């Protein structure tokens, strides 16, 4: 639910490294 400080329109979340995932063009964790 919280933004990880990275967007993800065409490129995936580098913040997957800290457990974030792309939702609504934004990288989020819970």
């Amino acid at each position: 639910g919280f933004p990880c400080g990275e967007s993800c329109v065409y490129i995936p979340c580098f913040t997957a490294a800290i457990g974030c995932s792309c939702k609504s063009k934004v990288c989020y964790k819970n």
Side-chain angles (χ1 to χ4, degrees):
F2 288 95
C4 307
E6 175 184 8
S7 292
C8 56
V9 180
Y10 296 118
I11 302 86
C13 297
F14 161 67
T15 51
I18 61 171
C20 302
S21 303
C22 194
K23 314 279 148 63
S24 304
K25 308 190 289 194
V26 174
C27 302
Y28 283 97
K29 196 176 192 177
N30 306 319

